[PDB]
């Protein structure tokens, strides 16, 4: 119970496109379509999270006049060492009665820092991407918003008009198979698998969730012999891998991605990637259409261009004089692909005139304007603009 209009627009956000709906035996219809946003959300699989590690060192066991013994503890990066011939000094002299027969048991292990819930990087496995689009349509003199998945199998009905967006011509994504996420920044990184991190590098400590309980650690923790008459636990360890990636990470994908991709998080997605085209299907109901006989008839048409500038914007002005049979709404459309008209619909009266705004790149613009069902020839001499570089895209 209606007419299906199928058209294809380039995948470019912020550019209004004009489409002519021509149902046989019915008056032409002009629809303005503009992509507000195009979102590419990939499916994520969290491998692990990384953060700053914590070296837990308790009070050393100083055995005076005896030998301490190291116990094998099931802890990440657990290190134990008994040092012989120690003579530690405290505030009121020597801590031990014996001169040489004293031992110090030094113990240490690696665990997640308190910061891990606040400061962390996540390692994700990115695969197939779900495309979605937000489209603005100038339908019946009003702006309607349509939000649909760009797969070609998701019908969204707004004001009785059924919309089918996609499928996308390009399956391109700025994300690789392996990605790293830190706050509002996403990085394409071939991160080390889980259980294989290196010391002082990204993944020196790997846990599955910021609150998991077991954790993997490879920090090269080695305990050293304490200083003469000093109670302390000296050690050699590779510095935080997270804290160093955070310094040498470089520019995120928001800055490095091709096609002018905007990168957002929570969830991670590619916004406004200017790649390929987008097919659009609109099932316009029968009630919206009006017959050619029922629509006003146009005769004795003439076109004059008092002002024109060939630029990206509507730098052209055209005055079209007409003779109409009756009062009603008439659709305005350019029959020449090199010229685009700003207005989609105008109110016709009788022996009056209409004013339209047009955009062209040609210095000598020869174009036909279809007002309702009659065409009028426009002759335009357009001049160059003051600026060579523009801040907004055009058709």
């Amino acid at each position: 119970g209606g007419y299906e209009h199928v058209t294809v627009i380039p995948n470019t956000v912020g550019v209004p496109y004009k489409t002519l709906v021509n149902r046989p035996g019915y008056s032409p219809m002009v629809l303005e379509m503009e992509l507000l946003s195009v979102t590419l959300e990939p499916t994520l699989s969290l491998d692990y999270i990384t953060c700053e590690y914590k070296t837990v060192i308790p009070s050393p066991y100083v055995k005076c006049c005896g030998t301490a013994e190291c116990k094998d503890k099931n802890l990440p990066d657990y290190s134990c060492k008994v040092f012989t011939g120690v003579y530690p000094f405290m505030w009121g002299g020597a801590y031990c009665f014996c001169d040489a027969e004293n031992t110090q048991l030094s113990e240490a292990h690696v665990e997640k820092s308190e910061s891990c819930k606040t400061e962390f990087a996540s390692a994700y496995r990115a695969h197939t991407a779900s495309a979605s689009a937000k489209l603005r349509v100038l339908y019946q003199g009003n702006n309607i918003t349509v939000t649909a998945y760009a797969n070609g199998d998701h019908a969204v009905t707004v004001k009785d008009a059924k919309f089918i967006v996609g499928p996308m011509s390009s399956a391109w994504t700025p994300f690789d198979n392996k990605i790293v996420v830190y706050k509002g920044d996403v990085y394409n990184m071939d991160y080390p698998p889980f259980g294989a991190g290196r010391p002082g590098q990204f993944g020196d400590i790997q846990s599955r969730t910021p609150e998991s309980k077991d954790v993997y650690a490879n920090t090269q923790l080695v305990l050293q012999r304490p200083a003469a008459g000093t109670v302390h636990v000296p050690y050699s360890q590779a510095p935080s891998g997270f804290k160093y990636w955070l310094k040498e990470r470089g520019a995120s994908l928001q800055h490095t991605a091709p096609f002018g991709c905007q990168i957002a998080t929570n969830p991670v997605r590619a916004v406004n990637c200017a790649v390929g085209n987008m097919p659009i299907s609109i099932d316009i109901p029968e009630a919206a259409f009006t017959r050619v006989v029922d629509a006003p008839s146009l005769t004795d048409m003439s076109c004059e261009v008092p002002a024109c500038t060939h630029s990206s914007d509507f730098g052209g002005v055209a005055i079209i004089k007409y003779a109409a049979s009756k009062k009603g709404k008439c659709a305005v459309h350019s029959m020449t692909n090199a010229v685009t008209i700003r207005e989609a619909e105008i109110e016709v009266e009788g022996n009056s005139q209409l004013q339209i705004s047009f955009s062209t790149a040609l210095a000598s613009a020869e174009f036909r304007v279809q007002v309702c069902s009659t065409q009028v020839h426009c002759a335009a001499e357009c001049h160059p603009p003051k600026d060579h570089i523009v801040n907004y895209p055009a058709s």
Binding site: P88, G92, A94, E119, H255, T256, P258, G260, A361, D387
Partner: protein
Amino acid sequence: NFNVYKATRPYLAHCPDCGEGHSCHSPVALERIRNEATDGTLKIQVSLQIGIKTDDSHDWTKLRYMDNHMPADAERAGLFVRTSAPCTITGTMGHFILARCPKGETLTVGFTDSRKISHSCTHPFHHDPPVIGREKFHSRPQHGKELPCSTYVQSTAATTEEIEVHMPPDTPDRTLMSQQSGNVKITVNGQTVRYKCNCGGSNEGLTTTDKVINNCKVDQCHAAVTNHKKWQYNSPLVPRNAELGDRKGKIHIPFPLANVTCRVPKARNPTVTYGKNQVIMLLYPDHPTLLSYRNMGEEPNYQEEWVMHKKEVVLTVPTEGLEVTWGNNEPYKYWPQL
């Protein structure tokens, strides 16, 4: 009422630099310096307790430190934190200090006691906090771009974060021993003293009363007082209690780390001039500003440079388009005219 400080106490611990590069048993010893906060805030752990008096009462103008066997009161105003230059202290509670420090290679925390003797502890610590955003600014603005950052909250509240605590070890003290004509006299002074002598008869035990060791020299004996009444942080700079196994306790700590918002300023828009397939920008930065650019096509060719002073930049604008980011400002987009 709840006061965790009734059980805990300030202590003396090893410090590698107490002044002029000499090691000492410091009452202001540094335990751990935390720098997880992206805003630059440092969470410093010290051996003394700030905001608590010797009688356990909470007083923000007071400080509690270990004064040779017994804790003593000191002024909060006398407490100082410094790296290469003095730091700005943002919060103090117990063993913890919150401070905003300039670029440095060492970290010093000190105070002034009763008899005006300044005690300080210097530890080697590389401090150079990373830049938040794309502009290296000095002073924080009221209004600007909202970017995610972390800090240690000023709240006193005891939740989330924690530290391990245990009973302190036997404190050696040679003043407990004296010579009674030519023998060894151990004066208990209403304390529990553990003693060991290199002589016959009696040389062991934990005593609550005065003991005498006949035909023994003062150098041949060792005496230590036992403190089984209070709690102390599980410090690697203090020895473990020998007459106790793996017995430990835990207490909640102030100022935990949490995500907040950092206000960043936007560099002034440069004077823009256009040409044939190219853009010219006259940059006037007040501070180091990151300038980045990319093509909006198949080959983005990302390039970046930190602009320090007055510089003119000539960039080629391709048919696909050019995106330019000048500091914390929103990216500028350029396209050539048909």
